[PDB]
Amino acid sequence: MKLSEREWLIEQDKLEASGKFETCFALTNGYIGIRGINEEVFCEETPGTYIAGVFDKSTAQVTELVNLPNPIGLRIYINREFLNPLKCEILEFKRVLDLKQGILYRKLRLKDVKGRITTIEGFRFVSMNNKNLIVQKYDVVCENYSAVLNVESFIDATTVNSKDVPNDRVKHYEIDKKKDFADGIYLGITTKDKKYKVGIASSTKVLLNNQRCYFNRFTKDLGYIITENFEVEAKQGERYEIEKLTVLVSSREKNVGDVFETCTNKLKEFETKSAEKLLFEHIEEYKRLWDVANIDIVGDEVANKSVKFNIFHLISMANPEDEHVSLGAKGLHGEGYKGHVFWDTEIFMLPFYIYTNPAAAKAMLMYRYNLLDAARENARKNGYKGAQFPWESADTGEEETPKWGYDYLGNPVRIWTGDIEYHISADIAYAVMNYVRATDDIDFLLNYGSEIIIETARFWASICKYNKEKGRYEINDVIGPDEFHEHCNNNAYTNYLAKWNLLKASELCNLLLEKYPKYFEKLSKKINLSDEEPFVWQEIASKIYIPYHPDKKLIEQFEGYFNLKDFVIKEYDQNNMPVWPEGVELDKLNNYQLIKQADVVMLLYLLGEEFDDQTKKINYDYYEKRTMHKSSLSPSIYALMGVRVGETNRAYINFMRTALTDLEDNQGNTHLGIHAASLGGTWQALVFGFGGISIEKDDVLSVNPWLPEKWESLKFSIWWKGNLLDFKITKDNVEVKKRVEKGNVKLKIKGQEAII
Amino acid sequence: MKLSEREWLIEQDKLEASGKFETCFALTNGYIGIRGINEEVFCEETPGTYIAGVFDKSTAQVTELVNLPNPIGLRIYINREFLNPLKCEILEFKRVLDLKQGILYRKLRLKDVKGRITTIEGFRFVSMNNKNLIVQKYDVVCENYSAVLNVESFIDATTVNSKDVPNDRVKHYEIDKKKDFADGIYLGITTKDKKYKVGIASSTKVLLNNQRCYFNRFTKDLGYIITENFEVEAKQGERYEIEKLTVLVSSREKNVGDVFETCTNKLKEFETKSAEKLLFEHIEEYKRLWDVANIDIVGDEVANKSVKFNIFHLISMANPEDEHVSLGAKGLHGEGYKGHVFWDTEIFMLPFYIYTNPAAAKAMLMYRYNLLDAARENARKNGYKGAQFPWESADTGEEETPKWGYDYLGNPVRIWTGDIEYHISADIAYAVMNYVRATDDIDFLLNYGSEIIIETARFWASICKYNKEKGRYEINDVIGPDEFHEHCNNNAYTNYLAKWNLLKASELCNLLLEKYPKYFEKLSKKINLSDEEPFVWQEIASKIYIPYHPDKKLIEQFEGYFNLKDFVIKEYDQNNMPVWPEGVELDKLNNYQLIKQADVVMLLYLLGEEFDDQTKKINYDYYEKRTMHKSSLSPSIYALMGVRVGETNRAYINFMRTALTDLEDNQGNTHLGIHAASLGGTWQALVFGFGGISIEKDDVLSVNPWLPEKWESLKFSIWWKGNLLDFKITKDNVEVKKRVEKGNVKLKIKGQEAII
């Protein structure tokens, strides 16, 4: 293995425990996730070992993505004394994530108090093609000495969730078995609710010139830590090659029967290939994905690198084979938000997959399809009809939003988002149409998508409330995307999206009846559709209230938002983020016009082909200036929409706010996990903002790019109607090339229609 | 509580993890022992939690004193984040062991990265009179803030033995059960060989003005850790009191019945007593101990204070109520030597007890008595007779000396002390007489002691070999007190002591037959003692070879020793310990005249009333120059004999070495546990060296003091034939007063009879 050039490398400065790097250096294949801890597992490190879909509640308030035993641990002892990196003089330190190859490398050259110098150089990856497999390889060289070296491998099944918060800590698993099976060591667990079993097999070997070079192997059962240990009579300057393969299998897999048998056989197979060869198979997967997803920015090396970083974590975390999971708000990179799935995925993350790997996007839509029954049950429990998707989803599709937490001031507080942040159900319907529009996947629409869109429309028809005096339908006592304002009436974003979802479902019903009558019938029989429902939906939609001041062309975020105390945003912090205005009480956010994130502007982004340029510009200007950017979701959408409305003054800096969310930790909580929505947002702002792509009413692909000052070019590729397109954007021009000649693509390049 | 004056305080300078101070501040009551870690249990700390007599082997090479779960842990959290003292600015730090009240005290004033200042102040003790009880009491003041404090009490059963050595690391217990019993938390273990069960019940509470002030208690089951948590809405300046009581019960106690029930009942009674009542009981016990054992040295503060330290640890570690344990080589203060009992106890430590609290000496000797069957089996199976006491003893009395270890160069070695360091069995018979002569405890002598002495004489008769050519009995292939020399023939120390044991045994049989013939009958039947044996002993003893090299008057350590290469000890380190001469190889110590510790000079101390002053001088002079002091048993014996031969500067020098063994860590390995022999050594150097005491034939207490230049005054007390004698030595004068009268006392002060 050879490192990629610097352009592809993300570097940690200093040898130390770091929450931030544990997140940025977290490695996943969309099934296994592993936090970027150091292999020694130092004192203050937070390990993270996750398998997608493996959730457990036990004594916690809601179900949580399980922190499984930590299997990657590896220590070196010199004559039975732990070679402790933080205890040595550091002669050489390098530590990098290689985004092109998807490996985490680390090289240490250490001088201990005895003046002995040792080299430890190696890497690890979570296999993209062997989803069960983790691979670690480290060369060790005793440069000026000879000694007995103990290579210690260990699985640590003392891990817990919420390790730093005494109230919330819980161990979500019990240890079923531990075994020295000669060829390695095994530890198996069952989650405490008993819904999942996981096996972990690990096998370490120490070689010199590809022979096993250890005089003794022993194993230790230390309670809930099991170890595998190789003693080597190490001679000065010789190259001791340590390889550790670890396999994780869960009872989610078809169909395994015994995780122990499956683990250990899987490990046998992996043993017949070399570390070199598992690596090459791993790197091929990254080639295939980068070939489409890579974006080249010329003139801004910070932007270019930060964008590779965003994309890499996006391409790493999705598994199109798994139609029973989707992407948590922090990927598989940490515990913040408990591995739950929000609108972050449908609205921020999904378009990336729609346009770069449509099979991933479909799988994540199949997650929602498969939880339709839980969404129907969720509706029924709240007095509504159709499908009411939860604000926070895990494995069953029940509402997993906590009811209690702590506010900005550390006080206990009720959490209302699960209860009344309803827009999620519309967001999923929108994301369904977005996927089908892009791919022309009619099969999906007919068999799965239509049912989702119609059931969420049924939900919206149940919650809309007719106000007779006013001759309008309202949706009252909600939270819109701006979570600062709770118990609002007629959030415009919510009302509009509901209105969109209702008209979409009618339109679909009449299309399926006219054009796909056998599919219409099967849907109608499955979900009990009546002939009147399409009309009922048209009628509610025609009269849903949108708060709107025609004289000022301003869309009011929710009724009465205009009477609330205004406030000037006067300064930015070291990371160029808004700082709260003087006067503001952080538990009275409801009384001001300050907003957390894009809300009307989010609406203007999603349903933009239905508002005029003046409107978009006017509402952009009003809200952008009142936006605190207090969610990692916020800046991407203001970069993207800034461009779209000619208000490019601040487009660059919002863009760099999203792109550096975790690399500069600009929200201060990167240690909780990757800000997964902001990754998708960054990609969207380049392609739908700077790259100037927008979709028009007749599904014609319009292109009106704007590059910031520093950028001479921007290249990116998207899938559009089954055609792979290459865009090259420069200061002056736009070129679009099809990668396969054949098929017709209609574009509107700066007001001018063009065929390719 | 109020701290004692500074003369009675041992101070740590700096807040940190420290093996040295874990040992130095280990607290014990002779049942429980607890290493001097900080409440929080920082990452580099080495907990030790032991119960006397609780030993397990499992996968280890030999049985080891078990490191049980660590029950003392206590951490504070402010709004859910750990107040970690190592992460704060330390505005104030004080940590002392109070030798007089036997409590460990710490005060911190901490300033965190958020600017909040917190004070944490308190202490802990392992109850001297309630042998199952650990008491902890801390005050917390939030000096410039208010917040929610979480007080977390934890029992950590993830502990193991030999934690920092991978080959040797062994968890010696399984967790039987954990329970939240509302007024506390419970964890029970059973050791892996199943020989001991232990219950731990702990109760924490948080009070403001002696009223429970927490709004919530909760407990957590985190695998092999259980926690008890208290949430407090803490207000600036208020003093919150945390009290933690912990009960440890083992199946070594009588009538435990159900362990959970016994533990939680005991803690319930203790909970009826205030901490101040509990502390006053505890201090009263130390008061009773110090009233006899305190030694007052004037003119030298370093020596007066380190002496308090040495006696503190001795008085803390003996439980005269327990006749089935004795003192391990490192007390109950660490895992060094695995809790094994060696000649250290009978010869070094036991005299301190014999003269300051004989009841403790007698229990220690009953430990031996109760292990005679094992000593008989040990003899038998080695092809010998009588009672061959093991070199290292634990619970069963079988030989527990490891056969394999690592030499001075780090390489695997055969350890031969268990096989051929035979002198332990005479050492025990010596200790018996020593104890009996001081106390006139005839009953012990008739019922217990005589059986020991006679069965060890039987051993010595059975190992002696007749050399027909040279006309004498020999004991060949031995290790004597100087362990640098292995497979020696006729070690003088061993031959004389065997000769002493044989003759003592004949003598006792003659006394028993004549003065107590019923007892002589009962013992003779018990052990099948025939009429002829005592004549056999007398006969073997008359012909045992003693390497005199007259009339040089020079006792050769063993035969051939004088032919080995001589080296000059020339250099010393900054603690004044001998450094190896140049040209010495540490794997060839058998070929040199360098010795580890007192051997011939050990013999001149123990059987002093049998060699003349000229003889002593000569041998002291020859051997001291050759003594490396590579055992902490070495310096005290040379101080003592030094004074006895008027070689007197080197006496003070050796004395300060044994005084400071742990406080200056002069052997470099204080972190393993207290050097328990050296404690006794120090005491004996004072009383029998500088103090001038010896016992000459016919139990005449003789006194010929020599105080060092610095010393104006030396006071101390001893029990002699049931009399408590207070002694006061000044450079010119000696006085003696009875504080308790009993036996008649035959006293000589500088050749002259005296009265009292």
Ligand SMILES: OC[C@H]1O[C@@H](O)[C@H](O)[C@@H](O)[C@@H]1O
């Ligand atoms: O998980 C509980 C809640 O936490 C808040 O920090 C987020 O803003 C909500 O969207 C979420 O529902």
Ligand SMILES: OC[C@H]1O[C@@H](O)[C@H](O)[C@@H](O)[C@@H]1O
């Ligand atoms: O990322 C999870 C949630 O975090 C909150 O801070 C945002 O307000 C929500 O819109 C978001 O979905």
Ligand SMILES: OC[C@H]1O[C@@H](O)[C@H](O)[C@@H](O)[C@@H]1O
């Ligand atoms: O415990 C094994 C051996 O260790 C050595 O350090 C000691 O010198 C012996 O007296 C003991 O038997």
Ligand SMILES: OC[C@H]1O[C@@H](O)[C@H](O)[C@@H](O)[C@@H]1O
């Ligand atoms: O302290 C236990 C043992 O340690 C060894 O180093 C000494 O040489 C022995 O005499 C001693 O009994």
